[PDB]
């Protein structure tokens, strides 16, 4: 057929998937595949469908089919990498992410670098992780989640001043959690900021009354 | 610290023998470096090319791996190893080592890393991907006739004659020419109705590569 039709069908499938209906999304995706059996995007969309229907082996197959095409696959590589990650296939996830990072035109390139840092952490390679988080920030400094990873790593290495800078950077994204609040409390205390320590503690004591962090906060309080 | 001074010196002596073509002699100095520092990545790496040069792939592979055990992210060694893997036709592994090599953006020869990613892509039957890698290599180092030639060939095959010709001319102003490139230049001249070069290249080709498949095709007025 033609790319327009194929692409129209692919988005139809996505729209359905991007809203829970996966058994359905499959009909427009398969139409896309009838038009272009090699469509990397059609196969990738299908991979995410099976991935959603907790069918790992089917998802892996679709992802590999999409990678077989000689097209710009950074997005596909990044999603496959995420998939390999939850499948605990870390070394593989890392390789696909390295390949996804090659595309400088890809809008999510800095997220690809964040993912490289994340996977490096799972592999117990903190030093390369830091490097990857730093590369992500060099592309775009305003990514709270990445700054949080930097703050956490620097904090564990006792490099408190740089850690605080990154934590402050993360804090202006206003997206706390048990982990971020506890890191905030601990940093606040190194810099003797009782106001922040007390404040975050409440958000913790209130938003995550049960969490281990709350316990630690209580014990370090 | 003194021990590192002698080790480094021996590694340089070894690389000098290699560079001078005395491949086998390079081993003496390199084993000394290794006797001083059993885990020296640069000594293992140099020994690796000694073996690679002597067509002893098992030994070369083992030395490349020992060199990377030390520092698994050393771009120079990752690139030499991926280059080795490419020659051994172990494309998946070459690609993987080269992808890791590409991450050191301060590596002076990063342009070579991208050239290698492009060549490996060719063998994986992904010419559009090879092209992107080749363009990255030329952006980092414009003066690479061999990369310009691979670009010219790809563009020619894509019917993108003007960009093809452009890259070809850049390759030509670099010296070399072989059966392959003479034929490519001949076919490009024909497209841009340049009878002079077409007849001239066909000359160098009949003269220097009379037994090549390229000359055979040329005669078929190809």
Curated annotation (Swiss-Prot), chain A:
Disruption phenotype: Mutant shows an impaired export/assembly of the fimbrial subunit PilA, and accumulates this protein in the membrane fraction. In addition, loss of PilF expression abolishes multimerization of PilQ.
TPR repeats: 1-36, 53-70, 73-102, 108-140, 143-172, 177-204
Coiled-coil features, chain-numbered ranges: none
Keywords: Cell outer membrane, Lipoprotein, Membrane, Palmitate, Repeat, Signal, TPR repeat
Subcellular compartments: Cell outer membrane
PROSITE patterns: PROKAR_LIPOPROTEIN, TPR, TPR_REGION
InterPro entries: Pilus_4_PilW, TPR-like_helical_dom_sf, TPR_rpt
SMART domains for this protein: TPR (SM00028)
Source organism superkingdom: Bacteria
GO CC annotation terms, alphabetical: cell outer membrane
Membrane topology of the entry: Lipid-anchor
GO molecular function, one term: TPR domain binding
Gene Ontology terms describing biological process: pilus assembly; secretion; type IV pilus assembly; type IV pilus-dependent motility
Task of the protein: Essential component of the type IV pilus (T4P) that plays a role in surface and host cell adhesion, colonization, biofilm maturation, virulence, and twitching, a form of surface-associated motility facilitated by cycles of extension, adhesion, and retraction of T4P fibers. Plays an essential role in the outer membrane localization and assembly of PilQ into secretins which are dodecamers of PilQ.
PANTHER family assigned: BARDET-BIEDL SYNDROME 4 PROTEIN, PTHR44186
Subunit structure comment from the entry: Interacts with PilQ; this interaction is essential for assemby of PilQ into secretins.
Comment text on domains: Contains six tetratricopeptide (TPR) protein-protein interaction motifs. TPR1-TPR4 form the minimal region required for secretin assembly and function.
Name this polypeptide is given: Type IV pilus assembly protein PilF
Organism expressing this protein natively: Pseudomonas aeruginosa (strain ATCC 15692 / DSM 22644 / CIP 104116 / JCM 14847 / LMG 12228 / 1C / PRS 101 / PAO1)
Gene behind the chain: pilF
């Amino acid at each position: 057929g033609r790319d327009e039709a194929r692409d129209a069908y692919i988005q139809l499938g996505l729209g359905y998937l991007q809203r829970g209906n996966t058994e359905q999304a499959k009909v427009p995706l398969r139409k896309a595949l009838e038009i272009d059996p090699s469509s990397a995007d059609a196969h990738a969309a299908l991979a995410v469908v099976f991935q959603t229907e907790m069918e790992p082996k089917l998802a892996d197959e679709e992802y590999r089919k999409a990678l077989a095409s000689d097209s710009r696959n950074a997005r596909v590589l990044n999603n496959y990498g995420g998939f390999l990650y939850e499948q605990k296939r870390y070394e593989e996830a890392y390789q696909r992410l390295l390949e996804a990072s090659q595309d400088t035109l890809y809008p999510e390139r800095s997220r690809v670098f964040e993912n490289l840092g994340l996977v490096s952490l799972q592999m117990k390679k903190p030093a390369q992780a830091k490097e990857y988080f730093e590369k992500s920030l060099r592309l775009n400094r305003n990514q709270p989640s990445v700054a949080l990873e930097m703050a956490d790593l620097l904090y564990k290495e006792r490099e408190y001043v740089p850690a605080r800078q990154y934590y402050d950077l993360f804090a202006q994204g206003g997206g706390q959690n048990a982990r971020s609040l506890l890191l905030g409390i601990r940093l606040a205390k190194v810099f003797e900021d009782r106001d922040t320590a007390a404040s975050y503690g409440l958000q913790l004591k209130r938003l995550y009354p049960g969490s281990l962090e709350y316990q630690e906060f209580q014990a370090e309080k």
